[PDB]
């Protein structure tokens, strides 16, 4: 069939590295790109095509229990080892990541249908907001 | 509420760059990471947390009509300009991307519930397989 309609989830990707290198892609981009999986949404009407592709990355699970310090390796970030301790402050989840980096941690809390996440390292604060599906 | 259960879709991300720089993240990784959106799946049982995060990237739409040559800028790859011509060979969609790179194109076809994609540049072939949702 010529009908390529649908959403297609990548299950295999061979020699993406060599294709990317043939295209002169920066080796730092290739090292990240070879990790990605793809979802392709094709809307097709006869010979008219619209191909909508999204690239996706694993990220490691993080499991913890409040009050129990755990070892965390920040793969997908700086790949460092920290000793993380999560505690409640009221309804705010507070994490201190003890390690090389000073003032490293995060705070996580719900308000309404929104999840707030504040990440700290040194004097830098990154504020992320998520909406509930 | 202390109940952080659910799947949470990132809608905002401020100063991720400065947080990442404070963590000494390679500037090539930061240039890609600042583009990503996040989906966070939290399974929470009391004070026991499992946080499953996936990072996601836009990728530009590509719309075309078979037989009509179109200009394509390969953002998300080498960011080059090519003149793309897509044609049918039986049930196989064949694209030649005329430009600086020799033997650059792709072939795309259905077999069963699987979509096959072969990308070529120079003497390099990348073969991708997708499964229908």
From Swiss-Prot, chains A, B:
Q: In which tissues is it expressed?
A: Higher expression in adult small intestine and to a much lesser extent in fetal kidney.
Q: Which InterPro entries does its entry note?
A: Calycin (IPR012674), Fatty_acid-bd (IPR000463), ILBP (IPR031259), Lipocln_cytosolic_FA-bd_dom (IPR000566)
Per UniProt, all-trans-retinol binds at: 40, 108
Subcellular location(s) of the protein: Cytoplasm
Determine if rRNA processing is one of this entry's keywords. no
- Entry GO MF terms: fatty acid binding; molecular carrier activity; retinal binding; retinoid binding; retinol binding
Q: Which domain of life is it from?
A: Eukaryota
Decide whether keyword Metal-binding is in the record: no
Matching entries from SUPFAM superfamilies are given as: Lipocalins (SSF50814)
Which cellular component, as a GO term, is one annotated location? Answer: nucleus
Keyword vocabulary terms for this entry? Cytoplasm, Retinol-binding, Transport, Vitamin A
Q: Which GO terms describe its biological process?
A: epidermis development; fatty acid transport; vitamin A metabolic process
The written remark on domains in the entry is: Forms a beta-barrel structure that accommodates hydrophobic ligands in its interior.
Summary of the function given for this chain in its UniProt record:
Intracellular transport of retinol.
Q: Please give the family membership noted in the entry.
A: Belongs to the calycin superfamily. Fatty-acid binding protein (FABP) family.
> What is the name attached to this protein's record?
Retinol-binding protein 2
Its taxonomic placement starts with: Eukaryota, Metazoa, Chordata, Craniata, Vertebrata
């Amino acid at each position: 069939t010529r009908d390529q309609n649908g959403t297609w989830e990548m299950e295999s990707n061979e020699n993406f590295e060599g294709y990317m290198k043939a295209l002169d892609i920066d080796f730092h981009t290739r090292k990240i790109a070879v990790r990605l999986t793809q979802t392709k949404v094709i809307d097709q009407d006869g010979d008219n095509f619209k191909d909508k592709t999204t690239s996706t990355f694993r990220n490691y699970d993080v499991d913890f229990t409040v009050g129990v310090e755990f070892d965390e390796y920040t793969k997908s970030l700086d790949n460092r080892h920290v000793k993380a301790l999560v505690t409640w402050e009221g309804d705010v989840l507070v994490c201190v990541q003890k390690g090389e980096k000073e003032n490293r941690g995060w705070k996580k809390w719900i308000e309404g249908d929104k999840l707030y996440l504040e990440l700290t390292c040194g004097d830098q604060v990154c504020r992320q907001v998520f909406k509930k599906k």
